[PDB]
Amino acid sequence: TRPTVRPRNDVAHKQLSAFGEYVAEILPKYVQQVQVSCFSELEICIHPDGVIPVLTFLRDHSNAQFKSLADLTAVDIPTRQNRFEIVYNLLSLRFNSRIRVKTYTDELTPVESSVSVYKAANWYEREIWDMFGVFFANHPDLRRILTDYGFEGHPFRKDFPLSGYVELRYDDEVKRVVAEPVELAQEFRKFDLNSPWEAFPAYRQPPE
Amino acid sequence: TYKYVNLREPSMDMKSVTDRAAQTLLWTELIRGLGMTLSYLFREPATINYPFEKGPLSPRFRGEHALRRYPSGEERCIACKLCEAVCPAQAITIEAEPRADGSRRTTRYDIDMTKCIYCGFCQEACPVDAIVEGPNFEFSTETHEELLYNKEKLLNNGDKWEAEIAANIQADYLYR
Amino acid sequence: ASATRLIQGLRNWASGRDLQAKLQLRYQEISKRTQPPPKLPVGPSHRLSNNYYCARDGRREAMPPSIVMSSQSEKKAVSPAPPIKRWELSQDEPYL
Amino acid sequence: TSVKPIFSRDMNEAKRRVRELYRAWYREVPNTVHLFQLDISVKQGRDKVREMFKKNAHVTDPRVVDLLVIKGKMELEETINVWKQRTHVMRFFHETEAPRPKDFLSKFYVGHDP
Amino acid sequence: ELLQVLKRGLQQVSGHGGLRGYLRVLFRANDVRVGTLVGEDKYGNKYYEDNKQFFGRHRWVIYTTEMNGKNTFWDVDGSMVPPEWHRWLHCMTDDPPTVKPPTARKFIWTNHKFNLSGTPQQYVPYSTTRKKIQEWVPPSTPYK
Amino acid sequence: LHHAVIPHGKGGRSSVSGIVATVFGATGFLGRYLVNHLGRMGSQVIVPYRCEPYDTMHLRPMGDLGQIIFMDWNGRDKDSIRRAVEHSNVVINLVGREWETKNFDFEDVFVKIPQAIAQVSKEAGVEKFIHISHLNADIKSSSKYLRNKAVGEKEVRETFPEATIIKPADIFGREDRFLNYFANIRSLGKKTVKQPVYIVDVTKGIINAIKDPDARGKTFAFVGPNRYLLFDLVQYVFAVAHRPRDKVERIHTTDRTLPHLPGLEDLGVQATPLELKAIEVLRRHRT
Amino acid sequence: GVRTSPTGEKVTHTGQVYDDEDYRRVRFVGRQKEVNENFAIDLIAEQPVSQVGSRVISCDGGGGALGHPRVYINLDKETKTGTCGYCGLQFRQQH
Numbered sequence A: 001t002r003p004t005v006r007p008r009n010d011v012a013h014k015q016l017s018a019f020g021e022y023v024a025e026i027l028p029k030y031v032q033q034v035q036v037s038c039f040s041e042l043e044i045c046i047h048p049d050g051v052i053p054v055l056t057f058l059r060d061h062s063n064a065q066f067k068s069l070a071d072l073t074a075v076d077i078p079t080r081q082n083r084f085e086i087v088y089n090l091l092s093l094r095f096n097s098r099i100r101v102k103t104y105t106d107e108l109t110p111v112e113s114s115v116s117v118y119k120a121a122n123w124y125e126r127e128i129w130d131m132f133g134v135f136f137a138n139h140p141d142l143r144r145i146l147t148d149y150g151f152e153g154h155p156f157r158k159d160f161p162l163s164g165y166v167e168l169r170y171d172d173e174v175k176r177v178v179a180e181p182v183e184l185a186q187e188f189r190k191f192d193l194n195s196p197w198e199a200f201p202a203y204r205q206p207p208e
Numbered sequence B: 001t002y003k004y005v006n007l008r009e010p011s012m013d014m015k016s017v018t019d020r021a022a023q024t025l026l027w028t029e030l031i032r033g034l035g036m037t038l039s040y041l042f043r044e045p046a047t048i049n050y051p052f053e054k055g056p057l058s059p060r061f062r063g064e065h066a067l068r069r070y071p072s073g074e075e076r077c078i079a080c081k082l083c084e085a086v087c088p089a090q091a092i093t094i095e096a097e098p099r100a101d102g103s104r105r106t107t108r109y110d111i112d113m114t115k116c117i118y119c120g121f122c123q124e125a126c127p128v129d130a131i132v133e134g135p136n137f138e139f140s141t142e143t144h145e146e147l148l149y150n151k152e153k154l155l156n157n158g159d160k161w162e163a164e165i166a167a168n169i170q171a172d173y174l175y176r
Numbered sequence C: 001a002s003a004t005r006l007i008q009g010l011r012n013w014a015s016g017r018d019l020q021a022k023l024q025l026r027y028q029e030i031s032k033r034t035q036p037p038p039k040l041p042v043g044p045s046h047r048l049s050n051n052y053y054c055a056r057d058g059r060r061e062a063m064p065p066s067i068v069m070s071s072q073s074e075k076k077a078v079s080p081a082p083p084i085k086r087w088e089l090s091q092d093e094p095y096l
Numbered sequence D: 001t002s003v004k005p006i007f008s009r010d011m012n013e014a015k016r017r018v019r020e021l022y023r024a025w026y027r028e029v030p031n032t033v034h035l036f037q038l039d040i041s042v043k044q045g046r047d048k049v050r051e052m053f054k055k056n057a058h059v060t061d062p063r064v065v066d067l068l069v070i071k072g073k074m075e076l077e078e079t080i081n082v083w084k085q086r087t088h089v090m091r092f093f094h095e096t097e098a099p100r101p102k103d104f105l106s107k108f109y110v111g112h113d114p
Numbered sequence E: 001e002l003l004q005v006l007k008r009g010l011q012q013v014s015g016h017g018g019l020r021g022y023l024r025v026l027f028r029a030n031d032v033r034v035g036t037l038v039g040e041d042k043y044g045n046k047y048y049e050d051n052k053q054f055f056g057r058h059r060w061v062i063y064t065t066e067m068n069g070k071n072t073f074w075d076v077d078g079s080m081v082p083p084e085w086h087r088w089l090h091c092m093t094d095d096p097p098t099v100k101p102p103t104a105r106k107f108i109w110t111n112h113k114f115n116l117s118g119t120p121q122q123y124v125p126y127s128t129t130r131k132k133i134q135e136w137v138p139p140s141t142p143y144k
Numbered sequence F: 001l002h003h004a005v006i007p008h009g010k011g012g013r014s015s016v017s018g019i020v021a022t023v024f025g026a027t028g029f030l031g032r033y034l035v036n037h038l039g040r041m042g043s044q045v046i047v048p049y050r051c052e053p054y055d056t057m058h059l060r061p062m063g064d065l066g067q068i069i070f071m072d073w074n075g076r077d078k079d080s081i082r083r084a085v086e087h088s089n090v091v092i093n094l095v096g097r098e099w100e101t102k103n104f105d106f107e108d109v110f111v112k113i114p115q116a117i118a119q120v121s122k123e124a125g126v127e128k129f130i131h132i133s134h135l136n137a138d139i140k141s142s143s144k145y146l147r148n149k150a151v152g153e154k155e156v157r158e159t160f161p162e163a164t165i166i167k168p169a170d171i172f173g174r175e176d177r178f179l180n181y182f183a184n185i186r187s188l189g190k191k192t193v194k195q196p197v198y199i200v201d202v203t204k205g206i207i208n209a210i211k212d213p214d215a216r217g218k219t220f221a222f223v224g225p226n227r228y229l230l231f232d233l234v235q236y237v238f239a240v241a242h243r244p245r246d247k248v249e250r251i252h253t254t255d256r257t258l259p260h261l262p263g264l265e266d267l268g269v270q271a272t273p274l275e276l277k278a279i280e281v282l283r284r285h286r287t
Numbered sequence G: 001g002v003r004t005s006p007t008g009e010k011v012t013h014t015g016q017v018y019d020d021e022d023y024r025r026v027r028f029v030g031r032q033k034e035v036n037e038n039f040a041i042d043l044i045a046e047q048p049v050s051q052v053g054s055r056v057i058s059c060d061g062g063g064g065a066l067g068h069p070r071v072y073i074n075l076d077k078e079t080k081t082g083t084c085g086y087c088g089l090q091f092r093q094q095h
């Protein structure tokens, strides 16, 4: 208990609980889950038709400033009707608190493209388009950054395998570097390590 | 606690403005920079004449990938496959058979020296300390064929020296 | 160094920072190796007779995150935290 | 089932935007075969452009057609700029076989191609 | 005292042994820092450690000609050292290997065959495995 | 037959194919494109070089990981040639120099080289040996080069019966000899028929013959699909290039068809004309 | 203990030496095959059979924390010697 166990502080837990119920009171149009972890960071789980209202609210209003933007990743969870998750990760400058706006989406329907209100979101948005495929309507510039120009597939899905379909080599028949389907030298032997016996008891989902 | 920089003002006294004017029209601070660089000229440079003076090191370097063996005995490995399970680029490849005795042994033990990223995870992981990151770092190889070490390569590379390896392990078996 | 007085005087004159003292050619704190074999102590583990692992069972203490509102006059509007205090100029040679 | 599509409302705007994009590709290819110092006649390049249009012909949904229009527009912009190179344009073609036919006989001699 | 350094500097020219031996190690690469003779070892090579020089120029090795018959007057390689002096020379210790020479092992080569890429003798990769599936041989008797 | 010789799946980049190919020469032109097409096929290629290792260093990495292999050889002895054919499934004679040197004339390369290698190939147990030659190299006049190739054809026909004697016409490509000689001159013209054939049609035919059994012993000759005038060809080369001695006898004299013996379409590979590839390959004009 | 193969190539400690139908011989051209010269099988008969009079004894491997972990072997077979799996060297009991 006292040694080697990272102690939690319930003060931040209670204050973020009050702040979360406050947000769910004042924006009832879009709020679904307001969850607080044990390490006391706020997680607000949101429908993707209030991205512009929630961010235009949470940038201002003088109960929570939150100027700073960070990570946006649309973490691909299958077995859902909506695969991808846009995760905005917002930081204050006056208050020292971190909130995670997790809004959901699918492969095709656009989110509202936050670049009009957070200027940092431009290359983050271009990266999420080039790696996942979440189109951003009413956005100025969608190009490819971090992948090749002759490349397609949105490689950070789960449906894109670890090796590539294309692979380059030089050949002198045409004096240039050409693309061929993959012919590995070793298998990348993947080891089964999902060991049984339920290493955590508090997270048992309800069975049938 | 904050200690900000660049907050002075130009003092309009005659002394300060004629000092800044002398700085401008008389190249004084540039001569100061030349003075600092010549002050490092007349030192003695810390180079080492390389192929005669090798550099310093630690007794915990990660080099050659040797194998060991028991005192007046046979090989120390077992083929317990922990090093293939922990090799973070999976350069280790182990195919194991038992021989005519019954004690378990190997057939094939491979390191890709290309894919080896020299962690020391197979140094920490091996229970009998069979594989040791070797001491020296001189590989300098012409072809790509040579850089795929075999088990007999690693045995003849552990037979090439152990006195180094045994001295370093006895220096540093107490920490790790 | 290990040399005459005129060139050492020109070195001190080209930069008055006492060049013979701190010269970046070390001769003395080459660490005396083959040290005595160090014993690594262990603190609040391996003590017998009380170390029930269920007591310090820190992995199992991770609760699932507590849920507040869903889709499935109250004098309020607190902030997530108190406003952070404005700092101070430090004493260790500030500006100005 | 609440779906907000990208640009169109039905396949009429799909046909409109794809015929505009094909017009752009048709007048953009001879500029590139002048610029990149290629090895390919103009009509061979135009035929493989219309081949790439014909490959995706069995798509019905308006969102997917609009998203293909987006993909083709992005790559046409990156080819009218000089941001791509000769490797990429030759990567669109196939002058490095890949020779394996669709014969069951050749897929019997060459092993294990059902 | 500028002429005293030229007098002191002329002595380590003769401290190597003379002129023709002096010209040998000078035109080999550089070194004129002779004077201590810590250790000689088989294949003729010598080892010097001074305490007036700093960390990195403590210890150095001078190789002999034709140690493996390879005309190594020129083109000295790395790993032309035996391994105990390889422990001594990287400053992995404070003792020469005349303090603890041996080991309790009867398998060490007498040679320390040096770096051998681009030679008549270089390493090759090969599978250390026997037959895979043991292809069947048809019987030798004829029929019909 | 023995394992690790059977084919495996797809082709190229350590996809192992059946052949183990010993290729002579290959530091020049046609052997280099043949090594490239074997590396695209993905087989183990033994190449002996008498020359510097640096030239085969620049034509080296087309093979995959440990696929190609090097050794040394000469045109005097048999021990290095036997060392080259210690274990070889197929072997090709692609040798020749188009100008006489001090140590070797046109004599004794075409005479001395194929005797020894055909002898040790028939002895040391190889299969499907393939020998190149020039088209219409006869006993007829005006070329010591071509009569020596006729002598070599006589020897390779007589000893080692089960060969494939093959001959292309004058071939053109990225490092061609005579087309670069056409671009690099200084000039006059006659009437002389000539068929050129692009180099990759020839090497596709060669590798199809080297993997195809049951068409062996039949000698082949290669066909240019146009077969038109020399002076029109020089006009077309100067037109696409924007500008207005045994070799010169060889190019001026004759290049004819021979309907006796089969060619491209009797093996099944599409011919490519001069004009398309000539627009492709004629760079290096002004600016 | 190399074997006089018809190829003449050195065998290994594992029976993997080639045939006359192997082209890996012709990739060993001019490059001398480095085989292990000191084997692992025959180095047990070089070591004497130790005799420890007790019943169930303990093997470590020549020094603490340098070797194999503690293995407590049994010597109850009247005619078969004990054998540590890690070490490989035998033990006998003295009545």
Ligand SMILES: NC(=O)C1=CN([C@@H]2O[C@H](COP(=O)(O)OP(=O)(O)OC[C@H]3O[C@@H](n4cnc5c(N)ncnc54)[C@H](OP(=O)(O)O)[C@@H]3O)[C@@H](O)[C@H]2O)C=CC1
Binding pocket: F024, F025, F026, F027, F028, F029, F030, F031, F050, F051, F074, F075, F093, F094, F095, F096, F097, F098, F104, F109, F132, F133, F134, F135, F168, F169, F170, F171, F177
């Ligand atoms: N139109 C054409 O180009 C035609 C070509 N051919 C054949 O195609 C091949 C390639 O054509 P090309 O470029 O003109 O010829 P190359 O000279 O380029 O190719 C022959 C290769 O073998 C080497 N070689 C030849 N003779 C000797 C020798 N006596 N000793 C050692 N090495 C030798 C050459 O030089 P090195 O030793 O420096 O490696 C070169 O590596 C040749 O075999 C030629 O006979 C035949 C008919 C028509």
Ligand code: SF4
Binding pocket: B076, B077, B078, B079, B080, B081, B082, B083, B084, B094, B125, B126, B127, B128, B129, B130, B131
């Ligand atoms: S971890 Fe050690 S004992 Fe286990 S297989 Fe690897 S080298 Fe052998």
Ligand code: SF4
Binding pocket: B086, B087, B088, B089, B090, B091, B092, B111, B115, B116, B117, B118, B119, B120, B121, B122, B123
């Ligand atoms: S040090 Fe090398 S062999 Fe060992 S685990 Fe790391 S990458 Fe693998």
Ligand SMILES: [Zn+2]
Binding pocket: G059, G060, G061, G068, G071, G084, G085, G086, G087, G088
């Ligand atoms: Zn034991």
